[model samples]
Target: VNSFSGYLKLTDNVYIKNADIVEEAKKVKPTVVVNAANVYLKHGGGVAGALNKATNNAMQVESDDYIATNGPLKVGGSCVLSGHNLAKHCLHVVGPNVNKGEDIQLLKSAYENFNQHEVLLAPLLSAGIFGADPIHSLRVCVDTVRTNVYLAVFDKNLYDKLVSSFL
Candidate 1:
């Protein structure tokens, strides 16, 4: 099992953790790993890019099909893809763009789009490449779930900040 420094309980099953997301993801081998992506499914940077490379571009092809049939996906909408490297499934979601000033409601909506499962691994949604405030984004995720949620922290600084918040 991957060790976590600390965790904040969101619900009976939901949680936010200060740990290595990639390591924890590998350890848990969740049924579905969530990927934050753009409507174009261009997995070029950030967590999406890493997941794209890890999945051998399988997610890109699947996401492309979803976008082609549905047009630009709404901020809260999502598309499912097959996992290749670690997990069994991939949940591709269109996270809110912080630059656009997308509100907490949309962020919560994006998070809630996730289907319930035994285990779900996710990043801090719009807080990374999408540029939203980490704390705010985290609150949204915490408020939206009742399932087993793992909020992975890849940045040490962010991890420390989150830990300090709880202390």
Candidate 2:
């Protein structure tokens, strides 16, 4: 899945893999970008796990200085989070599930805090057992969220499964 072909493509069907996030960010150059939720992390840390270390790294990538919620944190490996300092509006949401009410509150506050910023990235937790169905995840992101949704998937087969479930 690391190869180019392994990357997801965004078409009318609205199905895209993880790499699409980078591709779209480069191609569109939009002020406010919204990311879907499909990001996964190794056992060491889940998504949004290593925010403290990655904040500096994120700033370097030309990504806005925002926040992340529920993503992974690569403590080791090359995937380590250490250099992202790019935006005036970046938020990371890390959680086992947004349904926890507390997490949902934090996300809402973060969103309000960066309301003036142009690009906003939102990542969802797809593998958690919290929600009984895919629509539950969708519900967590509906309303207040007003941007494109990018869902990260492990492989083509998982993508297909999502599509089948949706239909």
Candidate 3:
């Protein structure tokens, strides 16, 4: 209440706001924060890249090593790795690239997998380079994460769009 904008409150599982994921992570201090990663789990750009930078490449390193050992992450698969700085632990999920019917299937699978964390923070998965329509993507993410979780959305204009059209 005191430190949020365009915030929405629910009964027990959410704290959505118009804020950066990193800043929100530092504020809420969740046990885990979700990242949208490719099947290879590269942190080269976008959310994964910036988050890797913010956390000192911690999750990226884990990704490099994890893939080497465990093999490539399949679509809609997720794995947890240690994080640095305020990130704590990074729960990386591989969202579909919005091809075929597997699009929603994989994204929804990733969301269902997220229920394991004590505290989870996530954003719009598959909505970036993976090319998901934010409207449907937001619906899946929001509908799946309907309890005991927090979400941070970076852009205020985007927030207004979501609010005006969907929230």
Q: Which candidate gets the maximum lDDT versus the true structure?
A: 1
Shift in Å, residue 76, candidate 1? 1.0
Q: TM-score of every model?
A: 0.83, 0.39, 0.85
Best by TM-score: 3
Task: Please provide, for model 3 over 1-167, each residue's C-alpha lDDT reduced to its tens digit, 9 standing for 90 to 100.
Answer: 23334567633555566778887777756778888788788888767887888877777777889999999888888888875665668888888877534556677887776777756777777766677876676677667765456667777887767666765
Where does candidate 2 stray beyond 4 Å? 1-44, 49-90, 96-118, 126-135, 142-144
How do the residues 46-156 of candidate 2 rate in per-residue lDDT, one tens digit apiece?
333332234433432322221134334221111213223322233333333444333333333332322343333333333333232444443344433344444444335
Alpha carbon lDDT of each predicted model: 0.74, 0.34, 0.73
Candidate 2 least-lDDT 10 residues: 74-83
Query: In model 3, which residue pairs have backbone atoms overlapping below 3 Å?
Result: 13-148, 13-149
Two-way lDDT contest, 1 vs 2, winner: 1
Q: Model 2 shows how many backbone clashes?
A: 44
Clashes of each: 0, 44, 2
